[PDB]
Amino acid sequence: MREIVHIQAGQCGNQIGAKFWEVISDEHGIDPTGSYHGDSDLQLERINVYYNEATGNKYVPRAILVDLEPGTMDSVRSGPFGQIFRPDNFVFGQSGAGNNWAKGHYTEGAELVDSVLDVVRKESESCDCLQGFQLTHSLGGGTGSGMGTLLISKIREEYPDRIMNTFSVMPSPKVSDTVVEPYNATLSVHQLVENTDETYCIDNEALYDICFRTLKLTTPTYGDLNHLVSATMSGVTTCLRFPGQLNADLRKLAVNMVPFPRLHFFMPGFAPLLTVPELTQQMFDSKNMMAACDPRHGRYLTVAAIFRGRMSMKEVDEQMLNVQNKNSSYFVEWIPNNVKTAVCDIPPRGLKMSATFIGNSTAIQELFKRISEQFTAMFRRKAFLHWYTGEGMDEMEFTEAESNMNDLVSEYQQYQDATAD
């Protein structure tokens, strides 16, 4: 057994965390009660990675639901599948975070945090071999951003030798008008660079543009966006949840994908939104990236691809060999064989062949540059500093997160520019 401990926080955190559990429950053959009505035993082989086994043959998500307002918490169990969760593992506040990061990190989240920590430990100590954690949250919603990054900091203090894998949702003025989101995200990133091993950048700008342009949804709902995210999220865990040639776990992914501890922000991709050449073509196409970044604007440090479906893998071998050949100037030459692929037989519900694409591209600096621009438009003005400096923070705490993220892109640009000879 290799147990990941799941953790949803804040508004966006809990919602994208719910559809995750729905989708993999369905793939693994598990109904909203927690019993197994599935065809193939391949759906149980690695079932303990995300699922506590309960007598009566009931499987309980190893999940910790968290928020500083009980609204989101109620909608969860009311939602589809709400009754497969462990009732103890809900941990709600009351006051709320009010889209302030200082409220989630230092003050109001700080009080609720030790109660969450208690729930982590109980589930952790029940693990034969703890991989580590994955946290779903957003980087604009005060609870997910500030408390999430505080809960990371605290979990790392107590499990410094476990992997910290987060799904972070990036604010886009095309999806939320709330003015202080460049502040929240930048303060979260200052933390994510230092205390996570692997972060999938789930960009709302990229989810919006996708639904608008490719899906032609004139006005898309947080339910249309989050439809993208569950297909993404189901992809980048397929090698955790199912057997394969490789013994995929959260640490082997970090070792192979993170050439430098700070450059651990991944660009995810999904296809289709077909023939093996088209998946491969699309899955490297900027239009299928779940981060608003062009790969052809930087270079790939490392890449991992998951082919789901029933396909001639010899074809996939040549197809993936084709893309690197024809796109060689877009993969750093100083990391040999930096493109790996796995192939799973079970496709998600509804597609006969998907492909999922994880990419450490130096073009992610594109995403961080956007947020660094929205930030400085405010900080040059000192706008809204009272929501934070009132909660006790210094101004140099904003300057420091700003120079930290500035550096993170300098470094992405340093390795895009680097050459072998």
């Binding site: 230092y106 900091s153 790392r156 006790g392 923070m393």
Partner: protein, 67 residues
Amino acid sequence: KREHEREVIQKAIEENNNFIKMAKEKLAQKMESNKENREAHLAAMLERLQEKDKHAEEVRKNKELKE
């Protein structure tokens, strides 16, 4: 000639031994420098995570200087 016959067999023993020795010591040296090293690293990670809790004290104490 017998004196030399026993020097050779004594040299083979001497060397087979000095080899088992330098191995045994090279390992223990490596394993020790490794324990030190790996620990120094985990202690560094905590000393800085813990300076994060001292800055959560300073931050909260500033907001009590607000009332």
